[PDB]
Design a protein around this ligand. Structure first.
Ligand SMILES: [Zn+2]
Ligand SMILES: [Zn+2]
Ligand SMILES: [Zn+2]
Ligand SMILES: [Zn+2]
Ligand SMILES: [Zn+2]
Ligand SMILES: [Zn+2]
Ligand SMILES: [Zn+2]
Lengths: 273, 274, 274, 274, 273, 274, 274
């Protein structure tokens, strides 16, 4: 027994580690939280801290009551997770009345969860309701090209979504619900956590202008691939725009044709363009 | 008997897909790869085959591939995961006696099935077999980043595109004198794109799917990979060049022709005409 | 006793220099890194030390650093080889009682010496110790690709450059609110450049050397690395943005202020006027 | 005695070709590398050579090479595979007593041969031996992505190209003061290009092949590699800069001259006129 | 990438760790070696040491040429493997002519492979030939009861084997080839490595009087279970003998009946009893 | 919908098997466990069922269990591995409309099948159902160490054995007044032992297999586990006692009878007679 | 700075005491453990120390241990709780300049004190430092179950007991060739027992206290723990063997000699006569 080999800890190491390599998380940039089941961490009750530190939650979140999550630490470097999981990751369990959580394991050296926790938890609640409990991952990282594009594209859900679909055939099917865009906002605040969550209701992908992206999915790999796909399209777009813009592209009709062949319903406002 | 995951072809598949992921050509479940094998290759591993092989109707009869085994990437599988769990992302399939379908002999575990571009692959294999008299054995599809970008700026035309790519790196003309075919954008994973791609495979070993990716054929894994990598390298150069305002000079026609002669290769005419 | 190569500082030096290399910031013998340690750190490895530590006189006295040990990268050594042979590219040195020089206690084998820049480093370590009440312990120089590029494109003025870098990534303002100092181009390795850099270190933890690279200071290897990585990340974003025709929108002057407040950090005033 | 695979030179060849691969400079069979050894190096492994070393008549004799052994990359070999199988992609060859040919003492298995360029290499080694009093021992060719791109945008003229590259990174002037030679595009593999490259090697340690790649000479593997990496790093910076609208500022003429003086190196003068 | 999460390193941590808990490996007692394929360690060539230490092999073993193994270290405590794999485990590769091996990874702090390496490698060769390459694991541990029994039972392959089969119905089928017994022998010597190997030819389980047991199997879990089964029978026997011996037991006829039902051919000398 | 591995019964199975491994009652693939479920239990998880459920002929018709689902341990599976990979060591099976066989709805992945003691389990379930009017739902087999040892020293006789076990711990009489049945040694995994065990299940909820293990039935996982654990605890006491030379005193008949009356339970007569 | 609870010594103390508990060697407040550290070890945690370290006079002066720091288990503390709250059951103490006492620098909270046996410990640390030229740094006392049992059965004579323990596990002779000392039963906690134990420590690294427990010395926590664990393992084997009627065969007197030779270790002479 050594929780560090559990599926979820290994999963967190792989996600963060890959994100590092993709160059989406310099310094302490980015954060990741995964909703677990008591059953996942039950085998390790003796691997936890016997003196659980408690931390009041920024605001009541009863829907996540008695729920455990494994999270990245605040000020922690994705690049270091793999070398010292316990020091950069932590397993937390929200009390019986969503008022706060206890740090069951990790987040050693008086470390604490990521500063975007409010944003994460709020998005989780909304994604739970929207996906009937399916989605279990919330991921934030500074996808280089997605970031760049927010300085050139009109920050509008529909047009941005439309550009991203055109940037890679695959995109319309991976995220038919398009991607939401918020106006720039001071980070780590509850004000921004709610805005993000508000958007998670309609999209599984949210962009933070001049900052990064937020993604939700059922598993680590599905979420990672979600972002990687959007970011891949963005990387293509950046090149294309650098070469002077599109000569031709995927047509509206074609996108609709694509949506049909895969039994998926594309965001309407994006198809209008 | 050595487990089949230590076979040369399984390791080959892990290597190609993994290198492709590293190159950044296969995000999410993007890209797929299929390799035609012989009975002798998988014959030693009968003992690793599933005991109730799954059978899957084939899109259309392909008698030319009857009783032919292939190792293939799975549907919705991530190239990035092939190394960790081969059996879960790769599968060895065998086309029945009348090219009507195939059995999944090994892998593609947990209800997984072959790639959704299978029709396109098998179709292209048949042509590449007829076109290379059995020499070709690999069909590879991946989202080569620059090649993709270029399809939004260059005239989607075989000749033009082929020409630019030759200019983008001296060896391109020798690695792919047959030039590269370009199809109009097409809803993917269908037979429609399968047929079209195959039609093009008759004339070229390299085919581009606008706003999507590239398709490559070759005798071996490394050759096929190198084929794409060369086209994609040229594309990477071109992208930079176009971003800097375009070519000030380049390889001339006389030179491309001089290049073709020295390596005893016959360059696609329409491409040289430009 | 656990060999010194497993110490947290030798491992830290390998990780920093290696990551820097993987990032493309240290071609050939480009870049160097020095970390100030404490006796309690190397004391445990008296067994791995050189029986007869080579001593090298410091051109100019560094008494304020008397008795202080540092682990440093060597001269002409390739960051890419640090991991290959730590002792051969790294060395632990200890400044004597009156800062007249230092003894090479460990590593720096086969007659190797610290970076020819130990002076600029030591000079900066001083100003940084003063500026942070002993907090900063690392001085890092590397050829951050994009930061370098931007120096050919942006006004080499601490304020303007600083504001661009803050706009290029929300986090920047909070990680380096005192902005980044920019020196005019200068012949590398000269006392002139060591003095200029140190002058800037009194004010900024990040200094740029036009058409050359960046200089960073921090309390720990990861902090200093992350400092540079953040500035370089913002630079990478900016380079793309400028390549696409410039910013359509960005972080407002106001908003940066709102940001500085939210993280109770005070932003370099000039970068917020212009 | 220890297997030759763990030799300093075999390991060096793996690391150079592998790093080159990882840099994206050697797609397919692009690039090649040769290193001149001393008998003393290979001596310890006399028992690792083939009992009946295959001899191979050299195109034209080269008495200055007579008896000198080299470890070289193979023909049609993929740099990316050196890692997995050195013996199959590398070979140690020894030139006879009158430099009329050589014997493949080790490696180059499965009937593989040296790069179909040993002659361009060997010819250049000769000039470099005379130009450096026997110091340079390596000739490296690779498809440096950005250097290649720049040849489609800059005037393919030694002086101007050399000047752009010096401006692209402060240490360039110091690392290659003799500048870089630029040949007009030419059919690779011919002897004309072998000749032309060699004539350029007398003046420069760095030569560019428009729309193809670069050629480098140096004393050690890491040096030669760092030579190219530095030129290529400068090119990478330049490509970004040009993509953002050209230089606002840069290193001045006086400054380069100042830089040269300080490092006791004499900058190629034509590159300072213009 | 971090070899410590590979299947085999995790496997070595689990085997040693379980052995610890079973109480079969105090101090540095016990050792474990697993034969790998280049393909298993190929993904990690950059996780290895760039300055491979070499160690002449006690004697020529060409059959294991170019073969990599992950092994426990000499003087290492099974109980510590899980907490510091690299320091207690090492991946070694035997040269092209079975003369020695290079320490590719782990065995940090100038540590080296287990002192029973000769015994292991020799047994491996014999198990390779006897199982047509199947078996890949050689495990040595101080199984408490198996050890005790060697002070009370006649140290004879047949009688010992027969007692162990009677001690648990399951035994005859798990190890029909019975278990070999060597006379006591000075340990860590080549003299004892050959004797063990000589026995591995006929049995997959070998006992070292007043010392421990040696087991071979195709996988970590199959080998571990092999020993655990023998040791379980031994634990039953010890209790039974402590209560005065067997009143009744499994008959010869019954053992033969058992051998038939499972399509296995029981060691003849053991069935004679 | 919550994955089926988080269902109460799957977690229950992980808990029982894991606790059993810890208790040292299930080495190698020793032991097996089966739990009868209702349609409502697995009804919510239809979406986790395999899409081509495997069907397996049943040893003999068991109409009494028609359309009845069970979660079971796999054949040759190690209790110790259930926690790590439930689906690979556990399986949910459903007996078809005429008790002729079952479908593996979920789990028992990778060609795995139910335990080899299945016949015995189902047979015992049918009797325990008839004997407890549907109350019992669990059948558990494990190699309880002491119980096993005792079968080599005590007269293999229901009454005697039952008596000793009651004396071995006061609560035994109340936990299992029906006493424990003992079968003669029998080749395992057959129907022969399946039938015999079932015959005994009619009279007892606890059955011993000389030189092998124990079989237990109960309404729930915990109760069934506690049943065995109590018998095995008594056995553990007895073993110690016998090792110390036997009982000096013990619970008298009058006392056992007094015990039975207080807890309104009727003790197996033959056992009290002794 | 990384909190001191993560230091290698605090973690070591948790692991030792905890394993000891899991083994059943430390019921209630049974057992204690002390480890001699060096300044370089705790120096880094001056931040976690008590601002006003409690000082406690040592009954008798321990000048030879002046200025020496030790991490120790507390008085009345339960080994089972060490992990639960290190600071509450462990403490780091430092002996003053003239060994007149020590200051409790860290831990030992809520008015807790070192084990009432710090004296016996300190006394033994001295003799062991003398005996091993500063090598031994750990003194461990625990109630090893089987070792305790054997003291009621074997002759309490260093030689006889030592020989039994060597016979009980091949490794024993090499791990403790100087044998184990046996004292007559003695009231615990008395200076008499501290002096007797120390007397024995001069000769053996392992000492037994009839009807009580064992005392061990070693260079590291793992070495000392493994020392005891080995002796206790041999004891466990012996207990079983004696319970089955005694040895039928064993390691011959001769063979033990052959063993001592093979590991170039010299076995306690008396244990080999008898
Ligand atoms: Zn962020
Ligand atoms: Zn595709
Ligand atoms: Zn520099
Ligand atoms: Zn070339
Ligand atoms: Zn042993
Ligand atoms: Zn059984
Ligand atoms: Zn005590």
């Amino acid at each position: 027994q050594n929780i560090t080999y559990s599926w979820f800890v290994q999963g967190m190491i792989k996600a963060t580690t890959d994100a590092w390599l993709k160059g989406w998380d310099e310094r302490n940039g980015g954060n990741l939280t995964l909703r677990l089941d008591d059953a996942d961490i039950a085998p390790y009750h003796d691997n936890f801290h016997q003196q659980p530190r408690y931390i009041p939650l920024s605001q009541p979140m009863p829907l996540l009551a008695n729920t455990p999550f494994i999270v990245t630490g605040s000020g922690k470097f994705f690049r270091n997770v793999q070398w010292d999981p316990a020091a950069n990751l932590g397993i937390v369990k929200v009390d019986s009345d969503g008022a706060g959580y206890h740090i069951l394991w990790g987040l050693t050296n008086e470390a604490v969860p990521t500063s975007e926790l409010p944003a994460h938890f709020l998005s989780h609640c909304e994604r739970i309701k929207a996906t009937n409990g399916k989605d279990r991952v919330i991921m934030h990282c500074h996808a280089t090209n997605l970031i760049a594009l927010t300085y050139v594209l009109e920050n509008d859900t529909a047009v941005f979504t439309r550009q991203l679909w055109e940037g890679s055939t695959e995109c319309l099917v991976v995220f038919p619900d398009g991607v939401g865009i918020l106006p720039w906002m001071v980070p780590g605040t509850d004000a921004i956590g709610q805005a993000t969550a508000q958007e998670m209701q309609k999209h599984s992908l949210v962009l933070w202008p001049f900052h990064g992206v937020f993604g939700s999915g059922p598993t680590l790999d599905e979420t990672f691939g979600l972002i990687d796909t959007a970011e891949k399209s963005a990387q293509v777009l950046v090149k294309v725009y650098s070469m002077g813009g599109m000569k031709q592209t995927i047509s509206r009709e074609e996108l609709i044709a694509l949506g049909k062949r895969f039994g998926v319903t594309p965001l309407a406002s994006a198809l209008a363009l």
